[PDB]
Write a protein that holds these residues in place. Structure first.
Motif, PDB file in Angstrom:
ATOM      1  N   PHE B  90       0.836  -1.193   0.000  1.00 17.31           N
ATOM      2  CA  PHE B  90       0.000   0.000   0.000  1.00 17.31           C
ATOM      3  C   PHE B  90       0.876   1.251   0.000  1.00 17.31           C
ATOM      4  O   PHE B  90       1.938   1.268   0.623  1.00 17.31           O
ATOM      5  CB  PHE B  90      -0.928  -0.004   1.214  1.00 17.31           C
ATOM      6  N   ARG B  91       0.443   2.296  -0.699  1.00 15.81           N
ATOM      7  CA  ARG B  91       1.276   3.489  -0.840  1.00 15.81           C
ATOM      8  C   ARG B  91       0.497   4.768  -1.152  1.00 15.81           C
ATOM      9  O   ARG B  91      -0.633   4.720  -1.643  1.00 15.81           O
ATOM     10  CB  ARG B  91       2.335   3.254  -1.919  1.00 15.81           C
ATOM     11  N   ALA B  92       1.127   5.909  -0.874  1.00 18.38           N
ATOM     12  CA  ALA B  92       0.533   7.218  -1.144  1.00 18.38           C
ATOM     13  C   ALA B  92       1.550   8.204  -1.722  1.00 18.38           C
ATOM     14  O   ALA B  92       2.718   8.200  -1.338  1.00 18.38           O
ATOM     15  CB  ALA B  92      -0.087   7.784   0.118  1.00 18.38           C
ATOM     16  N   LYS B  93       1.094   9.050  -2.640  1.00 18.41           N
ATOM     17  CA  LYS B  93       1.953  10.058  -3.259  1.00 18.41           C
ATOM     18  C   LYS B  93       1.362  11.452  -3.099  1.00 18.41           C
ATOM     19  O   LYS B  93       0.372  11.641  -2.394  1.00 18.41           O
ATOM     20  CB  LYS B  93       2.177   9.770  -4.747  1.00 18.41           C
ATOM     21  N   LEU B  94       1.990  12.428  -3.746  1.00 18.06           N
ATOM     22  CA  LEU B  94       1.521  13.806  -3.690  1.00 18.06           C
ATOM     23  C   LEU B  94       1.544  14.483  -5.060  1.00 18.06           C
ATOM     24  O   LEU B  94       2.596  14.598  -5.691  1.00 18.06           O
ATOM     25  CB  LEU B  94       2.360  14.605  -2.687  1.00 18.06           C
ATOM     26  N   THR B  95       0.377  14.924  -5.518  1.00 11.99           N
ATOM     27  CA  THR B  95       0.279  15.715  -6.741  1.00 11.99           C
ATOM     28  C   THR B  95      -0.364  17.063  -6.437  1.00 11.99           C
ATOM     29  O   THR B  95      -1.547  17.132  -6.103  1.00 11.99           O
ATOM     30  CB  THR B  95      -0.543  14.993  -7.820  1.00 11.99           C
ATOM     31  N   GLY B  96       0.414  18.135  -6.569  1.00 16.47           N
ATOM     32  CA  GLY B  96      -0.029  19.445  -6.132  1.00 16.47           C
ATOM     33  C   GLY B  96      -0.277  19.411  -4.636  1.00 16.47           C
ATOM     34  O   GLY B  96       0.575  18.963  -3.870  1.00 16.47           O
ATOM     35  N   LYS B  97      -1.447  19.876  -4.215  1.00 17.85           N
ATOM     36  CA  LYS B  97      -1.842  19.763  -2.814  1.00 17.85           C
ATOM     37  C   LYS B  97      -2.691  18.510  -2.583  1.00 17.85           C
ATOM     38  O   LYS B  97      -3.185  18.280  -1.477  1.00 17.85           O
ATOM     39  CB  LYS B  97      -2.577  21.024  -2.343  1.00 17.85           C
ATOM     40  N   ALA B  98      -2.851  17.704  -3.633  1.00 21.40           N
ATOM     41  CA  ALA B  98      -3.752  16.552  -3.602  1.00 21.40           C
ATOM     42  C   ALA B  98      -3.063  15.239  -3.233  1.00 21.40           C
ATOM     43  O   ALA B  98      -1.927  14.981  -3.635  1.00 21.40           O
ATOM     44  CB  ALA B  98      -4.479  16.411  -4.935  1.00 21.40           C
ATOM     45  N   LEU B  99      -3.774  14.412  -2.470  1.00 24.29           N
ATOM     46  CA  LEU B  99      -3.265  13.116  -2.032  1.00 24.29           C
ATOM     47  C   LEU B  99      -3.562  12.029  -3.062  1.00 24.29           C
ATOM     48  O   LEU B  99      -4.709  11.837  -3.469  1.00 24.29           O
ATOM     49  CB  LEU B  99      -3.876  12.732  -0.680  1.00 24.29           C
ATOM     50  N   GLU B 100      -2.520  11.315  -3.472  1.00 23.02           N
ATOM     51  CA  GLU B 100      -2.683  10.210  -4.401  1.00 23.02           C
ATOM     52  C   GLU B 100      -2.497   8.908  -3.642  1.00 23.02           C
ATOM     53  O   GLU B 100      -1.388   8.557  -3.253  1.00 23.02           O
ATOM     54  CB  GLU B 100      -1.659  10.313  -5.534  1.00 23.02           C
ATOM     55  N   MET B 101      -3.593   8.190  -3.436  1.00 22.35           N
ATOM     56  CA  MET B 101      -3.551   6.944  -2.688  1.00 22.35           C
ATOM     57  C   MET B 101      -3.698   5.761  -3.622  1.00 22.35           C
ATOM     58  O   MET B 101      -4.529   5.787  -4.530  1.00 22.35           O
ATOM     59  CB  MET B 101      -4.679   6.905  -1.655  1.00 22.35           C
ATOM     60  N   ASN B 102      -2.886   4.727  -3.422  1.00 19.93           N
ATOM     61  CA  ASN B 102      -3.148   3.465  -4.102  1.00 19.93           C
ATOM     62  C   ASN B 102      -3.143   2.269  -3.166  1.00 19.93           C
ATOM     63  O   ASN B 102      -2.098   1.874  -2.659  1.00 19.93           O
ATOM     64  CB  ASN B 102      -2.158   3.237  -5.241  1.00 19.93           C
ATOM     65  N   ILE B 103      -4.321   1.692  -2.947  1.00 21.12           N
ATOM     66  CA  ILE B 103      -4.435   0.499  -2.125  1.00 21.12           C
ATOM     67  C   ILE B 103      -5.358  -0.567  -2.719  1.00 21.12           C
ATOM     68  O   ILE B 103      -6.576  -0.416  -2.700  1.00 21.12           O
ATOM     69  CB  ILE B 103      -4.978   0.885  -0.737  1.00 21.12           C
ATOM     70  N   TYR B 105      -6.805  -1.525  -5.141  1.00 24.44           N
ATOM     71  CA  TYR B 105      -7.965  -1.144  -5.935  1.00 24.44           C
ATOM     72  C   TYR B 105      -7.554  -1.012  -7.381  1.00 24.44           C
ATOM     73  O   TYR B 105      -6.571  -0.334  -7.679  1.00 24.44           O
ATOM     74  CB  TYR B 105      -8.534   0.187  -5.445  1.00 24.44           C
ATOM     75  N   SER B 106      -8.317  -1.651  -8.268  1.00 19.11           N
ATOM     76  CA  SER B 106      -7.980  -1.699  -9.683  1.00 19.11           C
ATOM     77  C   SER B 106      -7.672  -0.305 -10.186  1.00 19.11           C
ATOM     78  O   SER B 106      -6.579  -0.046 -10.687  1.00 19.11           O
ATOM     79  CB  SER B 106      -9.126  -2.300 -10.498  1.00 19.11           C
ATOM     80  N   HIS B 107      -8.614   0.609 -10.009  1.00 22.25           N
ATOM     81  CA  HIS B 107      -8.353   1.990 -10.368  1.00 22.25           C
ATOM     82  C   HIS B 107      -8.085   2.812  -9.118  1.00 22.25           C
ATOM     83  O   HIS B 107      -8.944   2.916  -8.242  1.00 22.25           O
ATOM     84  CB  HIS B 107      -9.488   2.564 -11.217  1.00 22.25           C
ATOM     85  N   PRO B 108      -6.871   3.381  -9.036  1.00 25.46           N
ATOM     86  CA  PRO B 108      -6.355   4.143  -7.894  1.00 25.46           C
ATOM     87  C   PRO B 108      -7.323   5.221  -7.426  1.00 25.46           C
ATOM     88  O   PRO B 108      -8.009   5.816  -8.255  1.00 25.46           O
ATOM     89  CB  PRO B 108      -5.072   4.788  -8.448  1.00 25.46           C
ATOM     90  N   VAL B 109      -7.383   5.455  -6.115  1.00 20.86           N
ATOM     91  CA  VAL B 109      -8.297   6.447  -5.552  1.00 20.86           C
ATOM     92  C   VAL B 109      -7.556   7.653  -4.980  1.00 20.86           C
ATOM     93  O   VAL B 109      -6.608   7.511  -4.204  1.00 20.86           O
ATOM     94  CB  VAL B 109      -9.219   5.843  -4.470  1.00 20.86           C
ATOM     95  N   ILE B 110      -8.016   8.838  -5.369  1.00 16.20           N
ATOM     96  CA  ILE B 110      -7.393  10.098  -4.984  1.00 16.20           C
ATOM     97  C   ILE B 110      -8.385  11.006  -4.265  1.00 16.20           C
ATOM     98  O   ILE B 110      -9.600  10.792  -4.324  1.00 16.20           O
ATOM     99  CB  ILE B 110      -6.888  10.843  -6.212  1.00 16.20           C
ATOM    100  N   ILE B 111      -7.856  12.018  -3.583  1.00 13.95           N
ATOM    101  CA  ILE B 111      -8.680  12.966  -2.840  1.00 13.95           C
ATOM    102  C   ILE B 111      -8.224  14.407  -3.053  1.00 13.95           C
ATOM    103  O   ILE B 111      -7.043  14.725  -2.900  1.00 13.95           O
ATOM    104  CB  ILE B 111      -8.680  12.659  -1.323  1.00 13.95           C
ATOM    105  N   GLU B 112      -9.171  15.269  -3.417  1.00 11.39           N
ATOM    106  CA  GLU B 112      -8.929  16.703  -3.493  1.00 11.39           C
ATOM    107  C   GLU B 112      -9.308  17.351  -2.161  1.00 11.39           C
ATOM    108  O   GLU B 112     -10.484  17.391  -1.796  1.00 11.39           O
ATOM    109  CB  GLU B 112      -9.744  17.322  -4.628  1.00 11.39           C
ATOM    110  N   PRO B 113      -8.306  17.852  -1.425  1.00  8.67           N
ATOM    111  CA  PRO B 113      -8.550  18.460  -0.114  1.00  8.67           C
ATOM    112  C   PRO B 113      -9.269  19.801  -0.217  1.00  8.67           C
ATOM    113  O   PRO B 113      -8.953  20.590  -1.110  1.00  8.67           O
ATOM    114  CB  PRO B 113      -7.135  18.668   0.437  1.00  8.67           C
TER     115      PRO B 113
END
Ligand code: MG
Ligand code: MG
Ligand code: MG
Ligand code: MG
Ligand code: MG
Ligand code: MG
Ligand code: MG
Ligand code: MG
Ligand code: MG
Ligand code: MG
Ligand code: MG
Ligand code: MG
Ligand code: MG
Ligand code: MG
Ligand code: MG
Ligand code: MG
Ligand code: MG
Lengths: 180, 171, 136, 63
Positions: B90-103, B105-113
């Motif tokens: 399981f892992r997480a990245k950072l794009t802009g101010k947004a969190l890029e999560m991959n756990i 899940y076939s298609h990765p899930v992200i969150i706009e804060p």
RNA sequence: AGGUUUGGCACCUCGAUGUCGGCUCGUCGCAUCCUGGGGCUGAAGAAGGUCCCAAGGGUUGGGCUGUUCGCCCAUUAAAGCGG
RNA sequence: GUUGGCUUAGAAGCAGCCACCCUUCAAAGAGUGCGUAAUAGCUCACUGGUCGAGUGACGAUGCGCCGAAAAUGAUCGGGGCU
């Protein structure tokens, strides 16, 4: 313990907490209205096992013993409470509860101590000194033993009201079964 | 409830009508409080009195103070929560101010804060939610927690710092 | 339960509890608040319920008891007479009447053993203690 | 404990229902021989505080 | 609780309210057969169990019987229950 | 003492029927719940500390809450009412 007003008027009663009652020595009797609140706080402490003093409004203090009480069904609270009087050292027979002190060695044997009768009527002499309880030692009896009324200690010559052979405390045997 | 409010030297509160605002080093945070309730500054440290002993009152007493208290610690030290990813790869990245999560899940899930909140991932499986508002930060990290709720068996998912989890162990 | 020989039949009416005391035969007892019939079962199950929660001890007393016979449709309609001799036996109880009483068990001991038997009973009930002492 | 009691008292099993069907009792001697290894074990003040200490159990065992 | 069962009762109808089953045509309730969202599990996965929310749509062709029912054949996401 | 005795493949506070005494102590039930195939492992009962003013338990009563699913379109007559 105390009361002030005691009229014939019935509807002045339950507007507050008060019980319609009476008292008599046979020399006289009269209207009664008694606060219920402190009464069942009082009778609780006394019952027929002892008398307590009465102070009516008008400065009259006559010591009396509780006699019979008529209770309301569907409720707790009493509706009546008869009272009787005291003439030393004659006065009427007093009901005495059986308190069964000490643990029998027959209850240790798998049995249960059971008091067949309580509040024995007896009598006499002083109603200053009245037998507010009755001590009965059960350690002696074990199983099948029926303690009768001639075995009960009543000091100062208090004659037994009921038959001498009447059973008061009898320890009951352990639960038994045989056939299918 | 607890009446006393410890107020730092860098914060300002003006209590008028239904508007009670605090301004400080971390920026302004304005949380509306009850009008029927009495809230004002007594000396230095803050005091919120209640009008009555009535049952529906005293309910907003214990509420109000900690709400202001939160605003106090909000514009002073701010707020942060630590999140931990557990489970295989399981892992997480950072794009802009947004969190890029991959756990898992076939298609990765992200969150706009939402604004006022900021994501931090100092370690690959370690996520930190930074922010002033103690309410929003809550639902922010509760959103991140949504993505995978730790399972009753291996406890795989997003959890809080060192929070301990019981395990079922089926087979 | 169902008894030996009798008069065999009845109608119905309701007053208030006459011969039920407050207390008797023990420390704690059970008192019915509503006019009703209790059957051969019910109280039979109430005994079994209470005793199950005890040591099985023989400390339980049942003041109530079925006398009144009740009837029923043989199959249906109004054709013919009144009928149904054995359908069930009932015992009428009126409010304030004391139903069961227990011996020697503690406070919660008989509180819970009355509560279990509280259900299985068509009426609401409340247990008790002794203040009024009447034996004559 | 009763492994040191039943054997020395000559009992096979023990009291199944100690209150109802009785088993038996024994002489005061059994207090001393079980008190040798129980000095550091049994928590007590010094000297004779261990006298009434060692065996109260046979009385509660049903033997 | 409901008002689909057998009944009770005899209230409108005997100067007439045509009775079973089918076919045709629908529509409604939800105590949901499927499908959709959930909690619990003696839920590892898969496959289930039970309870909860949910009535939008959907719910096969045949053999025996006048049958409704039911049993069987071959299927199905399912081969719902009543008015 | 200690895994109290009985019983069970073992059951040691806690499958379970019988019982439920003693020692130490400022104090700790042969023991309430969780746990194991069995003890372990984690809190309570009770003691001491740290902090402040009340807090906990049975019943009575007023008025409410849930329990409260049936077939054409709903509703207290309606609008609407805190
Ligand atoms: Mg009548
Ligand atoms: Mg009478
Ligand atoms: Mg009909
Ligand atoms: Mg008629
Ligand atoms: Mg016509
Ligand atoms: Mg016609
Ligand atoms: Mg539904
Ligand atoms: Mg589903
Ligand atoms: Mg649960
Ligand atoms: Mg699955
Ligand atoms: Mg169901
Ligand atoms: Mg249909
Ligand atoms: Mg166990
Ligand atoms: Mg079993
Ligand atoms: Mg026990
Ligand atoms: Mg331990
Ligand atoms: Mg602790």
């Amino acid at each position: 313990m105390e009361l002030t007003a005691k009229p014939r008027t019935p509807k002045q009663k339950l507007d507050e907490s008060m019980i319609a009652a009476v008292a008599y020595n046979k020399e006289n009797n009269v209207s009664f209205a008694l606060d219920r609140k402190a009464f069942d706080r009082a009778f609780r402490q006394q019952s027929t096992t002892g008398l307590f003093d009465i102070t009516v409004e008008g400065g009259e203090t006559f010591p009396a013993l509780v006699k019979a009480v008529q209770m309301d069904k569907r409720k707790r609270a009493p509706i009546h409470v008869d009272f009787y009087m005291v003439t030393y050292g004659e006065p009427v027979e007093v009901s005495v509860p059986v308190h069964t002190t000490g643990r029998s060695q027959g209850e240790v044997q798998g049995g249960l101590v059971d008091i067949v009768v309580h509040n024995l009527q007896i009598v006499a002499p002083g109603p200053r000194r009245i037998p507010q309880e009755l001590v009965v030692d059960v350690t002696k009896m074990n199983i099948g033993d029926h303690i009768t009324a001639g075995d009960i200690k009543l000091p100062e010559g208090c004659t037994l009201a009921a038959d001498p052979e009447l059973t008061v405390v009898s320890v009951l045997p352990p639960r038994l079964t045989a056939e299918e | 409830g607890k009446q006393p409010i410890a107020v730092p030297s860098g914060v300002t509160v003006n209590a008028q009508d239904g508007v009670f605002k605090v301004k400080g080093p971390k920026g302004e945070l304005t949380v509306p409080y009850n009008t029927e309730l009495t809230v004002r500054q007594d000396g230095d440290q803050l005091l919120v009195e209640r009008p009555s002993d009535a049952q529906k009152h005293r309910a907003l007493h214990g509420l109000t103070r900690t709400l202001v208290a939160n605003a106090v610690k909000g514009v002073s030290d701010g707020y942060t929560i630590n999140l931990e990813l557990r489970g295989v790869g399981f892992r997480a990245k950072l794009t802009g101010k947004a969190l890029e999560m991959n756990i898992g899940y076939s298609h990765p899930v992200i969150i706009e804060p939402p604004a006022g909140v900021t994501f931090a991932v100092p370690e690959p499986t370690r996520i930190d939610v930074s922010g002033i508002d103690k309410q929003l930060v809550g639902q922010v990290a509760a959103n991140v927690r949504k993505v995978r709720k730790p399972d009753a068996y291996h406890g795989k998912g997003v959890r809080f710092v060192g929070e301990q989890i019981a395990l079922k162990a089926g087979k | 339960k169902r008894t030996k020989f009798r008069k065999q039949f009845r109608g119905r009416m309701t007053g208030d509890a006459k011969g039920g005391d407050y207390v008797a035969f023990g420390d704690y007892g059970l008192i019915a608040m509503e006019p009703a019939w209790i059957k051969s079962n019910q109280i039979e199950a109430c005994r079994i319920v209470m005793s199950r929660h005890f040591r099985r001890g023989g400390k339980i007393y049942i003041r109530i008891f079925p006398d009144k016979p009740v009837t029923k449709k043989p199959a249906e309609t109004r054709m013919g007479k009144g009928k149904g001799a054995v359908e069930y036996w009932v015992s009428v109880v009126k409010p304030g009447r004391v139903m069961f009483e227990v011996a020697g068990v503690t406070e919660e001991q008989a509180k819970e053993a009355f509560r279990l038997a509280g259900h299985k009973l068509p009426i609401q009930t409340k247990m008790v203690k002794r203040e009024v002492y009447d034996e004559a | 404990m009763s492994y040191l009691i039943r054997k020395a008292a000559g009992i096979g099993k023990g009291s199944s229902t100690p209150n109802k069907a009785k088993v038996g009792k024994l002489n005061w001697d059994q207090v001393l021989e079980i008190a040798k290894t129980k000095m550091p074990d049994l928590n007590a003040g010094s000297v004779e505080a261990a006298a009434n200490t060692v065996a109260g159990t046979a009385r509660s065992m049903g033997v």
